[PDB]
Symmetry: C3
Subunit: 153 residues, 3 copies
């Protein structure tokens, strides 16, 4: 049987930080307190759970010198290698961004292309607001939830 | 290899609005805000199917406040998304949705909800519900949330 | 085709209450207000939804005498049985804990062992914080979210 995984991530928006999201950089928005890319983090966690390999802390720890400066793209590439070396093929992954700004839509196809090449399987990208409700609706943070489907050789 | 997708949606409760939820009409309840009928479970399901199939999200398909989709039922939206999914070459295997909120109570109409949604999706749809125990974005009867998954396969 | 399901759950944290989480005891932190095992509940809901069998309310009712005070392990044991009886084989399941305390990392592999034995299939365990934001970030509550994959026969 194929195996399913899921990951979520939430970070505060940091005013004046460059907006790194979905392995893109967005003009006219602020990023999150790596580069704070909530979508990349959720995707790593979905892939790692699908394959039984733990989560971000398990594999990256905190302030390890070998991960200094590394982006969401660097993390995804590394997670992809771990999943493949554990004997899995990646079927697909999806990620939904939850928050107000930036608007993901105008660059949604570009994100899908960037992320599908990082993962080596089709990655679906979507977005929603919460219509003013909760930490995301208040513009306090950005959230993402991701799924992945892998299968053992 | 089959493909999995996920969708979530959140709306505030709007006083006096008819409660359209899970493609059912719940009397004795409001009533989510939106350009649509505010069916949070239908929107989440549409998102889950569109994402499993790599076809975008609601904004991709229905746009913003388009005259053609005003007051559009969740049923309209699901039937439209089912056709897009099948035209793109996929068979829908199953889908699931969990409603997160205090009112209405889904339990009494859960089996009916699954019946309606399975007909519209063309595959078995699981329905569940949870409250928040008085906590968070929807812990007050402030709003309703839904989270949905879907599984599709070529060809 | 195999079938996917998802489950979420949120409980308030209560001072003094024993922390039963992921079918372990963290004799350590608070402490949710059955035994408040948010992760066991989410997992049950994911399995039931994949199999098309309802949710916790469907199956344990409300204040049913025979399930009054059923632990998380009791619940998953029964859910596993319902799923197999409906003619399904469980492929895998995953659960992410969302909250500040306890720290799941040091006992993550133990939780995976315990839960995999109870489900009869590989259970992935992970954890995240919300970096100070929302009900879990303020320490008012603990949440979990879980997926499951099952197949007929
Ligand atoms: N950060 C965001 C939020 C929404 N959107 C888009 O805007 C449309 C409307 O979003 P919404 O705020 O109604 O989200 P929901 O609460 O209806 O699910 C979505 O379907 C997406 O296409 C986006 O591109 N980026
Ligand atoms: N809007 C809602 C919310 C919950 N429920 C029911 O409440 C049951 C348990 O959710 P809850 O939050 O009320 O109770 P626990 O999650 O604390 O066990 C669910 O399995 C549903 O059967 C419902 O029917 N309609
Ligand atoms: N209650 C918790 C929360 C997080 N953790 C661990 O803390 C690490 C850091 O989580 P985080 O605060 O960066 O959460 P994210 O929003 O980045 O996903 C996680 O990868 C887990 O290994 C834990 O062990 N127990
Ligand atoms: C959509 C997500 C990620 C949850 C936000 O809700 P909150 O947990 O912030 O709810 P509040 O108590 O802050 O209103
Ligand atoms: Zn993160
Ligand atoms: Zn909506
Ligand atoms: Zn519970």
């Amino acid at each position: 049987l194929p195996r399913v995984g899921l990951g979520t991530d939430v970070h505060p928006i940091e005013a004046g930080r460059p907006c790194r999201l979905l392995c893109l950089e967005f003009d006219d928005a602020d990023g999150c307190a790596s580069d704070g890319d909530v979508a990349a983090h959720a995707l790593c966690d979905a892939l790692l759970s699908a394959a039984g390999l733990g989560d971000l802390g398990t594999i990256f720890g905190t302030d390890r010198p070998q991960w200094r400066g590394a982006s969401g793209a660097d993390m995804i590439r590394h997670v992809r290698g771990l999943v493949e070396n554990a004997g899995f093929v990646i079927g697909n992954a999806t990620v939904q961004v939850i928050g107000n700004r930036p608007k993901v839509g105008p660059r949604r196809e570009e994100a899908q292309q960037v992320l599908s090449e990082l993962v080596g399987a089709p990655v679906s990208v979507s977005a929603t607001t919460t219509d003013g409700l909760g930490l995301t609706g208040r513009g306090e943070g950005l959230a993402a939830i991701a799924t992945a489907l892998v299968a053992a050789e």
